[PDB]
Design a protein around this ligand. Structure first.
Ligand code: NAG
Lengths: 109, 50, 171, 172, 167
């Protein structure tokens, strides 16, 4: 019988399933995840420059100078600001800050 | 004491993927947030055993 | 699947074929040999990489949501913001996923088409000097060396050389 | 078509074929009958349902419509709202219409390719034991009972069994 | 490329084929002849024009830009205007760009599949009265121009071509 040539394709041990429109769970030789789901869980600097850690102070608490925010009396460059949800130290003498959410916006530039 | 270029509220991100699914509220140079659990791109062919 | 080479007439894969994606297996006297095609596998690599590069290059705009805060007296505004962010979010999710699904299909179909096309290149080159078995192999009507083989895999096959010889052995 | 089977070399389909989407029509010494194929019909069913389920799942109970009212000194904000809802209205419409067109076309071709793939499978199984009429039918060089027919339909055609008989009939 | 005809088994184009997209080359005694197929070339034209008309008709569900202005006291609102318009700009760009690409790819394979189906039409018509060379090539300016309108009496040339085949 035959001298003989054959035509065929790669297979391997890869269990990496992908989806298409017609099919689900389709096992392939080679895939590529293109969606990141991992961070480190740490809050870092950003292009080297560190953020402004307000701690228990609110923006007013800082900008006016509630004595409990005396750390913030002089402040280097920040890359962003980390303000807490309901920061303890803000308007010690109680009251109100007019157009606060627009000031809070202005700080983002 | 770390460093990043992309910054979520829950963590920080090194990757070169074109998407993430962590938090929407990111600061810095980041991938496009999506509500997806998975995005896998078939590059090879079907693995059919002999 | 759509071109019916992969998981089709070529029923299964070649776990020993590992120098590429597609290719040959010649079984003459001098030896055997899983040996990948060059042209088709390369072109298939160039296409796919070109594809995923064209996928990561399409969803790369910026910058921030700029993140805004609203009063207990501007709750329509706040919601409008919210509605527009979630809105865009959903759009870019759908877009990313559907693109994924569609280019996955088209990818698998591309390999299938690739393989078939190859088998069609070899078949139409050989012609009737062989038996198209239809397991994706060919059975020769002559003696093919590690020299006649390795002439088929680079596109060159003197049909009218082996023409009369194979016509004889055929009958 | 795109695969040239449906409305191509097979010019039209069979109203008598009812038990499925693709299959056979035999006419031997015993009988004469339509019979659909199991595997290709199930595989295409499986495919298309997955396709339509993957359509009703991709635009699903999310993008909403709270109404909002605005004064006569909120005309910008009012407009801003209109332009946003209309905007996303336009977008989802375009997405849905395009989706439907594309998946339609791919569906059609999917059937086409399916048919061809069937023809090609039976073909490359029968080889030169038969005659390619060019119409999507094969004329047997031998005799095929309601049995040799069933050996074709499920991919178990013994070529060497009928090989020499078909040969002797062929060179004549 | 996907159907293997264009820049495939039919290695190259015909610069003298200029009455259509696809078509034939007969070379018998009476003469030669570049001559474009009709049906297939017409049907391609209809499907391509149908496609681009189907692309111009999909980005016209449109707009007129009412352009707003804001104080130095309504900045979030301005940005919300900005972000929205930029956001939709990005979406329609993507759709537009992406559609072009995908419908480009499908146009190309559409031609490919066209040509391969043509060749498969002639091939399954002639049957074994000819040599399928596989360069994309395989009788009177009367037998030729009978094939190229779908009509070919096989059992006419059957016994003659069976004769000339065996000698
Ligand atoms: C699959 O093959 C690779 C080598 O190509 C090997 O490293 C790996 O261990 C194999 N997978 C398993 C778990 O057998």
């Amino acid at each position: 019988p035959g001298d003989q040539i054959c035509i065929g394709y790669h297979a391997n041990n890869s269990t990496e399933k992908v989806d298409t429109i017609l099919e689900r769970n389709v096992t392939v030789t080679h895939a590529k995840d293109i969606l990141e789901k991992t961070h480190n869980g740490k809050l870092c600097k950003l292009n080297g420059i560190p953020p402004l850690e307000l701690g228990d102070c609110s923006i007013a608490g800082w900008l006016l100078g509630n004595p409990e925010c005396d750390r913030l009396l002089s402040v280097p460059e920040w890359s962003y600001i980390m303000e807490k949800e309901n920061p303890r130290d803000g308007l010690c003498y109680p009251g109100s800050f007019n157009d606060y959410e627009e000031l809070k916006y202005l700080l983002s530039s | 004491n770390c460093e990043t270029k992309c910054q979520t509220p829950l963590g920080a991100i090194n990757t070169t993927l074109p998407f993430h699914n962590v938090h929407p509220l990111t600061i810095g140079e980041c991938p496009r947030y999506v509500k997806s659990e998975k995005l896998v791109l078939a590059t090879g062919l079907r693995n059919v055993p002999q | 699947g759509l071109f019916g080479a992969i998981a089709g007439f070529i029923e299964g894969g070649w776990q020993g074929m590992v120098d590429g994606w597609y290719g040959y297996h010649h079984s003459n006297d001098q030896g055997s040999g899983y040996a990948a095609d060059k042209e088709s596998t390369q072109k298939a690599f160039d296409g796919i990489t070109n594809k995923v590069n064209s996928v990561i290059e399409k969803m790369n705009t910026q910058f921030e949501a700029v993140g805004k805060e609203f009063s207990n007296l501007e709750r329509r505004l706040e919601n409008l913001n919210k509605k527009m962010e979630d809105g865009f979010l959903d759009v870019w999710t759908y877009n990313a996923e559907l693109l994924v699904l569609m280019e996955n299909e088209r990818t698998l179909d591309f390999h299938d088409s690739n393989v078939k096309n190859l088998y069609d290149k070899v078949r139409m080159q050989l012609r009737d000097n062989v038996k198209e078995l239809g397991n994706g192999c060919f059975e020769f009507y002559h003696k093919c060396d590690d020299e006649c083989m390795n002439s088929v895999k680079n596109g060159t096959y003197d049909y009218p050389k082996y023409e009369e010889e194979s016509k004889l052995n055929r009958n």
